[PDB]
RNA sequence: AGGACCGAACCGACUAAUGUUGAAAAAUUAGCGGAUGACUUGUGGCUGGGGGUGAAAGGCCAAUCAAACCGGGAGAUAGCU
RNA sequence: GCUCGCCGGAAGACCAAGGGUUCCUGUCCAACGUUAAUCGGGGCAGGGUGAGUCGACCCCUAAGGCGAGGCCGAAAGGCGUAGUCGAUGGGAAACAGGUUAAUAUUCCUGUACUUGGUGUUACUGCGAAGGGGGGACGGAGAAGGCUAUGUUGGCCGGGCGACGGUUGUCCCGGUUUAAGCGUGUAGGCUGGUUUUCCAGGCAAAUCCGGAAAAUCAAGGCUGAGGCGUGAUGACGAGGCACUACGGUGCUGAAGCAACAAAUGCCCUGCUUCCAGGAAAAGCCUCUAAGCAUCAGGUAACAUCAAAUCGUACCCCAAACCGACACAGGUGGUCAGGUAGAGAAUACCAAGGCGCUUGAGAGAACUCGGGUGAAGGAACUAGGCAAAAUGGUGCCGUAACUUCGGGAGAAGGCACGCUGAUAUGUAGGUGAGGUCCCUCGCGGAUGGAGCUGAAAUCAGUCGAAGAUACCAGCUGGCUGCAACUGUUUAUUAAAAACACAGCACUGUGCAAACACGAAAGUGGACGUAUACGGUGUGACGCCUGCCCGGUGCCGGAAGGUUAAUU
C-alpha cells in the first residue's frame, strides 16, 4: 500500500528547509528554539 | 597567469593504484591528488611549472569520502580531488 | 441551425447543437489573441468564492473591440469566427488603412458587409454611433455605460436594448431584463441586435458536456449534513425550514441590490 | 460519430474462501466493474483547524477527525473509582 | 561441472525519484542473516566514478512565490507595481569500435560536429529596452510511403552422427558496420516577380498590414527513407596458443537478395469535429536615437577556448516507501521466435532465477486441487460455492421500443489431416530485359522470382479436430433509479450523491454573492440567450383545492416607538 511518506528533496527543502525558516518570523522563532534547546540539526537542510 | 603561490598549493600528492600505474605506463596519464578547489586550467599549470612537463589534456573527478566507525564511532572522511594528467607522448615523468 | 442528434447513446439522445457553418474553421488571429488561465472560482486567498466552477477546455482570450473608436474609417468584415470566452460569435473585420479588429457579431452581418463607427456613420446595423445621433425607438447593442468607457450591456448572444425616450442629456434605455434604465446622450451604442441567437436552444444532453464547459457539480442542500448547509439533516427526506443559501439568507423572493449611488437611473425595475 | 460495444495495459473493488499473535495495522487467491473519458497518471503549485476541501459518506486534511497535530494556560476540574 | 525445474510485455535490460558506497578486490565469522555458513547488501582494509557534445549549472518563461517604492491594516502583518525567482515545458554541438576487478557517447582508436574570443584578408551601413515574423501548440480518424525488426533463400566455415536411416531438396555456426558529409526522393504547404501609393503596427522603417497596376506561369519552402562516402578500415565463425585453468596472444572466410513489417518515422502533416486547444527567449527581419574613411556587419582562413558540479551501485526492489533480507506500493524507456486478433494466453530465445531451515512419515483435522455410482437444489435465509457456457464464419432470432435498440436475443450448421482444382489458387510484391523521356531517386510495358489466404471435390484417423492454455450460462415476471458516472481510504457501492432537463428566485455591473477589520481578489477580462442561490431530477401524460398560520413581496394613511432636543 502507498504510505503517507513519499520522499521529494525539493518538497523537502521549500517546505521545511533553512530559507523557508527564515522567510517568516514564525520560521525564525522556530530555529531561536531549537538553537536555544541546542538541537545539532537545527533545520532538514543538512 | 596563475601565480606561483596558487600553483604551488595546488598539487597535493601522487596517487598511488593500480589503475594510476596503468594509466601512466598505457597512456602517459599522471594521477595526482589535488587541491579541492582546483581547476582544471590551474592544475595543468602546476604541473607544467613544477614538473617541466607539457601536458596534452586534464581530466579530474571528486571523489566523496567513506563512511567509518572508529571505536564504535561514526565519522566520515573527507572528499578529495583526484586528477588525471595526460602527458604529450615523450615527457617521462 | 438547431440539429437534434440521433439516439445512438443514451449520452447522445437528447442533444441538441448548434451548428453554424458560416464560422471560420482555421485558427484565430494571432495578434488579437491572449493567454487566460482558469481560476477554479479561487481568489487570491486561494479560497473558493465561487463554487462549482473548475476543469473545461484550455481557452485563449480574444481581445474585443468593445470601445469602437476608429471613427470615419471603414472596416470590411473578414470572417466570422467562434468565440469560447462568450455566447456571442464574434466578426474579424479590417479597417482601410490596414488595422484589424475583432467585434461582437451583429444579427446578419455577414462576410464581406461594411460597417463604421462616429457620429457620421450611416445608420444600419454594425454601425457604432452616440445615441443622441441614434434615432428613438431604435434596436442596438453593446451599450456604454459611460462615454469612452466601451459596451457594457446586451453583449449576449441575441439580446438587445431598445432606445425608448430622450430628454436632455440622456436616452432611456429598456433591457433585456424589462428594466428601465438612464444612461448618458454620449454614450455609444451599436445598431442591431447581438447575432448567435439559436444559442439558447441547445441541449446539452450530458453531464459531460456541462464539465467541458467548466461547469461542477451542485449539490443540494439537503442533501447535506446540518453542519454543511442549514437545509442539511433529517432522518429520510426532511425539510421543514425556508428555503436559504449556503450562509443562511432567504433565497426565494428576498431583494438583494443595495446600490443608493445608482438607484437614481433606475426607472423601472425589471418586476 | 459516440460520457457506444467486447477485451489487455491502466484505474477500480461486487462475491467467496484464506489470513485475523497475518506474508500484510486492510492483503492474497479465484471470479468482478470501467477501460477515448464527468478517464488515468508523473512533476511542481494553491487552499489550514470552527478553518480547508467534499458528484455529500460527517467523508478526507500524514495509519489521528461531530473539530488535526505540537507546545503552552496545566498539577484545568473530577460531590467519581 | 553436468542434469532438472521456473520467468521470459519479465522474475530480462536501461533509467528518473529516492537511497548513499550498498559497487570491486582481499580478509574475517563475534554479532547481524529467522538454520549452518568457508558465503553476504555483515565486520575490517584497500581500490573504484575521468565529458566543449550526456545531465545539471546556464539563457527563457507556466502555475505560483517573493517583491524596491507603494496601497491597506492596533502591532505582528495583508496585497501588489516595477521587477525578480520558479520546470513538470522552449533553447548549440559525437558517433562506431576497443578497453578495467570495478568508469565510460567521459579513457584509447578512427572519423566528426557546435558556439564563442582573437588576428590576417575581402566586401560592406551598422545600430534597441522599440515594430513585425517565428518559436507556437486541441481531440478524433484515415491512408499511403518507409524504417527498426523478422522470415526464407543465397553465401562462407564446419559436420556425416551412441539406436533403424542420414552425400542430401540433409545438419550446425556466421552472414555486422554508426555519427558526420554529399545527393535530394515518397509526401505536405504555398501562386511567384516588379512598380507606385497609404488614417494601421505608442516614433521610424526598406520589415509587417492595406490598396492599385503590370508581368510570368512555375517559383519557393518543408520533408521520411533510399543511395554514395565514411569503410583498402572496424567487427567477424572459427582456427592456431598460452593458463597462476578465473582470462587472455595471433589470424581470419562470407558478410548478399527476396518477402513480411510496426504502436517507431514522414506527421507540429492530412481529413474532420467542437468542448476551439501555454508563455517567453534563443532565431529572422525592420528601423530610432546614435556611430559615422570609427564602431559594427557578412564571408574565408589560422589560432585559442569551452569553466564548474554529477557520473560507482540498486532502482517493480534484500539498497526506495512499508519498524523486518516484509507475498504490499513505486513514474519513464526497450519489446525476439512458434501459435494467436493481440502488449491476452501456452511454450521457448537473449538474459535471469529455484524465492536462507532442512530430513523423514504418509493418522485425525485444516488448507489448495482432481475424479465420482444413482439422483439433480431435495442444500440453504439465499443455487453461497462449485459445476456449466465459452471461438470464427454462416443461417436465424420474439414481446416491446424513445426506431438507436432489445440482439451475441433464443437456436442451429461447419471446423483436424492428405491430395486435386492449382506439383501454390485469388490477392500482394515485383528482377532482369524492352522502349521512351521536360535525363533522374523518371515514365510506360513485361511478367521471372518471392509471398500467399479462402473455397469446392475426393479421401483418411480418432471416443472426441474452436481438442491444450484461452474463451458469454440462457430465458420469463416484478420493485427502485432514466442512462455513463460518484461515495462511507479500512465491515455499507446502494434505491444514496451527481446528472442532462424543468421551475422559482436574486442580480443593471463598482452586479448579486463569496474570501477579506482593510486594501483588494474571485464572480469575469463575463454583462440578463449572463451570473448566483434554491428545489426537482432523461423522456411521456401531467402537476388539482387552500394565503387562515410562518416566511417573502408590495403599501404608507393611521396607532405605537430610539438616539436627539
Ligand atoms: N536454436 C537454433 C537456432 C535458433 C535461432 C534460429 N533463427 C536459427 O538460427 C540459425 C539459422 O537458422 C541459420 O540460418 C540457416 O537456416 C535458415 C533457414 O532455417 C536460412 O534462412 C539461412 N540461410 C541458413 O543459413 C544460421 N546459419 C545460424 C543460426 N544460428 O536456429
Ligand atoms: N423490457 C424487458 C427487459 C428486456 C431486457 C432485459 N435485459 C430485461 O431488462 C430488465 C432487467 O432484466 C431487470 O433486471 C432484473 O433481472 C435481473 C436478472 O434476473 C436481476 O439481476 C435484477 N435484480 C432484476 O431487476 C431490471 N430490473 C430492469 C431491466 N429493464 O427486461
Ligand atoms: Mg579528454
Ligand atoms: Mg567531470
Ligand atoms: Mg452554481
Ligand atoms: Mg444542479
Ligand atoms: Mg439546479
Ligand atoms: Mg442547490
Ligand atoms: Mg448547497
Ligand atoms: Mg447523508
Ligand atoms: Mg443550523
Ligand atoms: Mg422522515
Ligand atoms: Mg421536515
Ligand atoms: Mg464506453
Ligand atoms: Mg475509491
Ligand atoms: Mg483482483
Ligand atoms: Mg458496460
Ligand atoms: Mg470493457
Ligand atoms: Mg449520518
Ligand atoms: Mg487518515
Ligand atoms: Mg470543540
Ligand atoms: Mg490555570
Ligand atoms: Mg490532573
Ligand atoms: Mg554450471
Ligand atoms: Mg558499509
Ligand atoms: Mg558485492
Ligand atoms: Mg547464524
Ligand atoms: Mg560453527
Ligand atoms: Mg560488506
Ligand atoms: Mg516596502
Ligand atoms: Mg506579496
Ligand atoms: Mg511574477
Ligand atoms: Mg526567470
Ligand atoms: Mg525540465
Ligand atoms: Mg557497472
Ligand atoms: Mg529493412
Ligand atoms: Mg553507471
Ligand atoms: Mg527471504
Ligand atoms: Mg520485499
Ligand atoms: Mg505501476
Ligand atoms: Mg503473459
Ligand atoms: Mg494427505
Ligand atoms: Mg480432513
Ligand atoms: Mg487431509
Ligand atoms: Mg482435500
Ligand atoms: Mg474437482
Ligand atoms: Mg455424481
Ligand atoms: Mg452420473
Ligand atoms: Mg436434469
Ligand atoms: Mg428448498
Ligand atoms: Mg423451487
Ligand atoms: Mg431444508
Ligand atoms: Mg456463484
Ligand atoms: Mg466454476
Ligand atoms: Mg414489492
Ligand atoms: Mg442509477
Ligand atoms: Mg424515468
Ligand atoms: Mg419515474
Ligand atoms: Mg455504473
Ligand atoms: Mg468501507
Ligand atoms: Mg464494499
Ligand atoms: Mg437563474
Ligand atoms: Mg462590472
Ligand atoms: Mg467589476
Ligand atoms: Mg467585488
Ligand atoms: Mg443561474
Ligand atoms: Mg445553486
Ligand atoms: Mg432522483
Ligand atoms: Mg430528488
Ligand atoms: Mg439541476
Ligand atoms: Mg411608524
Known amino acids: 500500500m502507498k504510505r503517507t511518506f513519499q520522499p521529494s528533496v525539493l518538497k ?24 536555544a534547546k541546542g538541537r545539532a540539526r537545527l533545520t532538514v537542510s543538512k | 597567469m596563475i601565480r606561483e603561490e596558487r600553483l604551488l598549493k595546488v598539487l597535493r600528492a601522487p596517487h598511488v593504484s593500480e589503475k594510476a600505474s596503468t594509466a601512466m605506463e598505457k597512456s602517459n596519464t599522471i594521477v595526482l591528488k589535488v587541491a579541492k578547489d582546483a581547476t582544471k586550467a590551474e592544475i595543468k599549470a602546476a604541473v607544467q611549472k613544477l614538473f ?33 594528467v595526460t602527458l604529450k607522448e615523450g615527457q617521462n615523468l | 441551425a438547431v440539429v437534434k442528434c440521433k439516439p445512438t447513446s443514451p449520452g447522445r439522445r437528447h442533444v441538441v447543437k448548434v451548428v453554424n457553418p458560416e464560422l471560420h474553421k482555421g485558427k484565430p488571429f494571432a495578434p488579437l489573441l491572449e493567454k487566460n488561465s482558469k481560476s477554479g472560482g479561487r481568489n487570491n486567498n486561494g479560497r473558493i468564492t465561487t463554487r462549482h466552477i473548475g476543469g473545461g477546455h484550455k481557452q485563449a482570450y480574444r481581445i474585443v473591440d468593445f470601445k469602437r473608436n476608429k471613427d470615419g474609417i471603414p472596416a470590411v468584415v473578414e470572417r466570422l469566427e467562434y468565440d469560447p470566452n462568450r455566447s456571442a460569435n464574434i466578426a474579424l473585420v479590417l479597417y482601410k488603412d490596414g488595422e484589424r479588429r475583432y ?55 441575441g439580446t438587445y436594448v431598445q432606445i425608448v425616450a430622450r430628454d436632455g442629456a440622456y436616452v432611456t434605455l429598456r ?44 449539490v ?8 454543511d448547509h442549514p437545509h442539511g439533516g433529517g432522518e429520510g427526506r426532511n425539510f421543514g ?23 437614481k437611473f433606475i426607472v423601472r425595475r425589471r418586476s
Open chain 2, 52 to 84: 617541466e612537463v607539457e601536458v596534452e589534456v586534464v581530466n579530474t573527478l571528486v571523489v566523496k569520502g567513506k563512511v567509518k566507525r572508529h571505536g564504535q564511532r561514526i565519522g566520515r572522511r573527507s572528499d578529495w580531488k583526484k586528477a588525471y
Open chain 3, 241 to 263: 425550514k425556508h428555503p436559504v443559501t449556503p450562509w443562511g439568507v432567504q433565497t426565494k423572493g428576498k431583494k438583494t441590490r443595495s446600490n443608493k449611488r445608482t438607484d
Open chain 3, 103 to 157: 467585434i461582437l457579431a451583429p444579427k446578419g452581418l455577414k462576410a464581406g458587409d461594411q460597417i463604421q463607427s462616429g457620429v457620421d456613420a450611416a445608420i444600419k446595423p454594425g454601425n457604432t454611433l452616440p445615441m443622441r445621433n441614434i434615432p428613438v425607438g431604435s434596436t442596438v447593442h453593446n451599450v456604454e455605460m459611460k462615454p469612452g468607457k466601451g459596451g457594457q450591456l446586451a453583449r449576449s448572444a
Open chain 1, 12 to 35: 523537502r527543502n521549500r517546505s521545511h528547509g533553512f530559507r523557508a525558516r527564515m522567510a517568516t518570523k514564525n520560521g525564525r522563532q522556530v530555529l531561536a528554539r531549537r538553537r
Open chain 3, 175 to 218: 433591457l433585456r431584463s424589462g428594466e428601465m434604465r438612464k444612461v448618458e446622450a454620449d454614450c455609444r451604442a451599436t445598431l442591431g441586435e447581438v447575432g448567435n441567437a439559436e444559442h439558447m436552444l441547445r441541449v446539452l444532453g450530458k453531464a459531460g458536456a456541462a464539465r467541458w464547459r467548466g461547469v461542477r457539480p451542485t
Open chain 3, 220 to 227: 443540494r442542500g439537503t442533501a447535506m449534513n446540518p453542519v
